[PDB]
Amino acid sequence: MIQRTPKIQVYSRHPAENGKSNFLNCYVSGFHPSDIEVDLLKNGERIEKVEHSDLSFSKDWSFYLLYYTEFTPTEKDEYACRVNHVTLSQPKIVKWDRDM
Amino acid sequence: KGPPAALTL
Amino acid sequence: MSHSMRYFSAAVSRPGRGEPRFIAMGYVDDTQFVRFDSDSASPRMEPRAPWVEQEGPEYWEEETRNTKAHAQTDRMNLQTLRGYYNQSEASSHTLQWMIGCDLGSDGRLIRGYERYAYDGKDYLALNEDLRSWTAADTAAQISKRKCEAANVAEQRRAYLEGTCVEWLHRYLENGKEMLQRADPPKTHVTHHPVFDYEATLRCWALGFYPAEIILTWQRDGEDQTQDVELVETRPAGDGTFQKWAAVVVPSGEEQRYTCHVQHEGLPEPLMLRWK
Ligand SMILES: [Cl-]
Ligand SMILES: [Cl-]
Ligand SMILES: [Co+2]
């Protein structure tokens, strides 16, 4: 079968500024089939409360979703996106880098 | 407005 | 300022967990305005943009009626295609669909479209002439011959040439502020030193609509894509989009590089440089 592993991006809606409020985004795209597991993590454990956009797909038929949550950044906390999919042996963890 | 019917394959 | 309306759907079988899931959704350009989900607990076509909420109960009743018909038809299509490939009842499959019209600055209607994909693979498409089909394999040839014999192309063409165009125009007027805007990107270049030999230049495009944008780095400038890291254009969450393009340059060399940005909301395209 056709199998396509998710592309993952972790980024804030707005510029990252410690103390100040923002949205933490995990954009998962380019995947097939549609079943997918996404969590956002604060210091290695799941953030409750997390929401997402409607499941859709692109012109090349691959699926996509935005997973998000309001948050305040602080130097020295890890923020991450944990993703599982039938194409992945173990989960993928992609760390939020303020610069990307 | 969507189409009135889908395609039978 | 090209414009399009698209309807999409996905029917996903899950044997031993109920009927196949069906989702349908309509877009104008990159804005979702309507949505149906068979798992909702009360499946119906629902508003996803404020400008479609002014449609009366007859519209919602007919959209919900037609979409439920499509759900059942695509569930039947999953059964039919499982047979064509001789796949087992125990296995899961995806049938995806796309229909749409492109208008053109003016106009109108440069292009109609209709396509099905089965398990991520191109299956059957309506050709640009909207009078003929292209089938991706032998299974699909059965579907193609069935559409030919039943003359279905003509009915699709009538929706594409008539209804799709007219309602796209309606929506573009009713949601004029959301749909016929062209938010240009806020742009800046960030600098990331590596003592003391090179640095990374990152060209940022932020808060722009619609998604279509072009970022390119050039030196002197004569344009290198090979060493450039270009991320996929991504949603901000507030309706606008984001993108960046990075290039690693020698240190002391930064003002020989320039970032080009092209986007509908621009004047006049943009040229950026680090300082
Ligand atoms: Cl496979
Ligand atoms: Cl394969
Ligand atoms: Co395979």
Identify the structural domains of chain C with CATH numbers, from first to last: 1-181 (3.30.500.10), 182-272 (2.60.40.10)
Say if the Cβ atoms of C190 and A99 lie within 8 Å: yes
Q: In sequence order, which residues have a C-beta less than 8 Å from that of residue A74 and are 6 or more positions away?
A: A18, A19
Q: Cα(A70)–Cα(A48) distance, rounded to whole angstroms?
A: 11
Written as one letter, the residue type at C206 is L
Q: Rounded to the nearest whole angstrom, what is the distance from the C-alpha of residue A3 to the centroid of ligand 3?
A: 6
Q: How many contacts, defined by CB atoms under 8 Å, are there between A and C? A: 63
Domain ranges of chain A: 1-100
What is each CA distance from C271 to A93, C4, C58, C221, in whole angstroms? Answer: 36, 29, 50, 11
Per the rule left: phi > 0, alpha: psi between -120 and 50, beta: everything else, A44 is left
- Closest CA relative to residue C8, chosen from C69, C61, C67, C91: C67
Q: Cα(A59)–Cα(A8) distance, rounded to whole angstroms?
A: 18
Q: Cα(C129)–Cα(C134) distance, rounded to whole angstroms?
A: 11
Quick count: other Cβ atoms within 10 Å of Cβ C249? 19
Fold for A1-100, please state it.
Answer: Immunoglobulin-like (2.60.40)
Please name the residue that has the structure tokens 């800046």: C188
A2 in contact with C, Cβ within 8 Å: yes
A7 in contact with C, Cβ within 8 Å: yes
Burial string for C210-222 (b: 16+ CB within 10 Å, else e) reads: beebebbbbeeee
- Closest CA relative to residue C124, chosen from C136, C113, C112, C132: C136
Q: Cα(A69)–Cα(A67) distance, rounded to whole angstroms?
A: 7
Half-sphere exposure of A99 (CA within 13 A, CB side): 9
Q: Cα(C63)–Cα(C44) distance, rounded to whole angstroms?
A: 8
CB A52 within 8 A of CB A38: yes
- DSSP for residue C54: T
Q: Cα(A11)–Cα(A100) distance, rounded to whole angstroms?
A: 7
Task: List the single residue in C35, C92, C234 with the smallest CB-CB distance to A27.
Answer: C234
CB C140 within 8 A of CB C124: yes
Q: φ and ψ at C244, to 5 degrees?
A: -140, 160
Residues present in chain A in total: 100
Q: Would you state the structure tokens that stand for residue C50, as one six-digit string?
A: 């404020």
Experimental method of this PDB entry: X-ray
